[PDB]
Amino acid sequence: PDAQTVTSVRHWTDTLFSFRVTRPQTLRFRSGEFVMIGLLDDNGKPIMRAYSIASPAWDEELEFYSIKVPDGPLTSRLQHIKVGEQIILRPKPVGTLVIDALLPGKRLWFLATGTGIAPFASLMREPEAYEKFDEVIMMHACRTVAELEYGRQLVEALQEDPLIGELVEGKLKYYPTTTREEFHHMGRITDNLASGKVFEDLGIAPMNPETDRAMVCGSLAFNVDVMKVLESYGLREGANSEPREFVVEKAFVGEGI
Numbered sequence: 408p409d410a411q412t413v414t415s416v417r418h419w420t421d422t423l424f425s426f427r428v429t430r431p432q433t434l435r436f437r438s439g440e441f442v443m444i445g446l447l448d449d450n451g452k453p454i455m456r457a458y459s460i461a462s463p464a465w466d467e468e469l470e471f472y473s474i475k476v477p478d479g480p481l482t483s484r485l486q487h488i489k490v491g492e493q494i495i496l497r498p499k500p501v502g503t504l505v506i507d508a509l510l511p512g513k514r515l516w517f518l519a520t521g522t523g524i525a526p527f528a529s530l531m532r533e534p535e536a537y538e539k540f541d542e543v544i545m546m547h548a549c550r551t552v553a554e555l556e557y558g559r560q561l562v563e564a565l566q567e568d569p570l571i572g573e574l575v576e577g578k579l580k581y582y583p584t585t586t587r588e589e590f591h592h593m594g595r596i597t598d599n600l601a602s603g604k605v606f607e608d609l610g611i612a613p614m615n616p617e618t619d620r621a622m623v624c625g626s627l628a629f630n631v632d633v634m635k636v637l638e639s640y641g642l643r644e645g646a647n648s649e650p651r652e653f654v655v656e657k658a659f660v661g662e663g664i
């Protein structure tokens with residue numbers, strides 16, 4: 408049912424892997440949206456979970472960036488998937504992490520923790536982000552250095568490619584941090600935005616409600632705290648119906664692994 412086939416798999420850590428699958432021929436989506444994917448349980452019943460599509464809308468395959476939860480009904484199984492095996496994929500994209508859900512502006516911030524970088528793996532590879540904005544800032548905070556690797560490699564490939572670098576024109580600013588392991592840049596996104604450390608580190612103007620638009624993707628706790636910081640700079644939450652300066656989505660439901 409709604410089956411698509413795994414074309415590649417990549418393991419990053421013992422809790423993180425990415426994979427790619429074939430795309431339904433009629434699937435249309437906007438970068439930043441999520442769909443339901445799944446596998447069958449031991450009784451032949453679907454185990455369905457929401458996943459951001461980690462590949463941009465132009466990409467001919469669909470990429471996903473996944474947690475591995477030991478004893479997690481879906482990921483305890485999904486972590487073992489192989490090329491040629493299949494997943495269930497519902498081709499019904501939705502979500503508020505989309506450029507259309509924000510007022511037009513000059514700078515676009517992506518604020519993510521852990522697998523919350525997933526919708527921004529798509530958006531950082533979306534032409535629209537660079538056509539409609541002069542600067543795209545990717546803040547990704549994880550506990551450890553290895554958890555940043557998937558995103559670091561994505562950003563490196565983008566910036567180092569001769570053509571893409573030309574088209575992007577220095578617009579992408581990447582600000583990875585750790586909160587536990589030693590790394591040259593540390594700290595929570597909330598703390599580093601509120602204190603202005605990120606402005607100094609990247610050599611950019613402070614957050615400005617006139618020109619800045621942001622998207623937030625992490626745990627509920629992260630989202631709540633980030634919203635407060637954004638609002639302290641004068642940015643207001645909206646979405647599609649009445650777009651304002653920022654949008655938020657949960658990277659997962661619960662407390663997190």
Ligand SMILES: Cc1cc2nc3c(=O)[nH]c(=O)nc-3n(C[C@H](O)[C@H](O)[C@H](O)COP(=O)(O)OP(=O)(O)OC[C@H]3O[C@@H](n4cnc5c(N)ncnc54)[C@H](O)[C@@H]3O)c2cc1C
Pocket residue numbers: 441456457458459460472473474476478479480481482483521522525526656657658659660661662663664
């Ligand atoms: C809008 C939406 C988009 C999502 N996008 C992604 C995504 O792109 N990639 C992804 O891996 N998951 C994503 N999730 C979570 C995903 O739906 C599942 O929870 C995940 O596949 C784990 O499923 P499970 O059955 O193995 O464990 P579950 O029973 O769902 O969860 C077990 C525990 O692990 C924690 N957990 C679940 N997912 C994560 C996560 N990704 N990071 C840290 N802790 C987690 C939860 O707090 C829960 O305690 C998303 C969830 C939503 C609501």
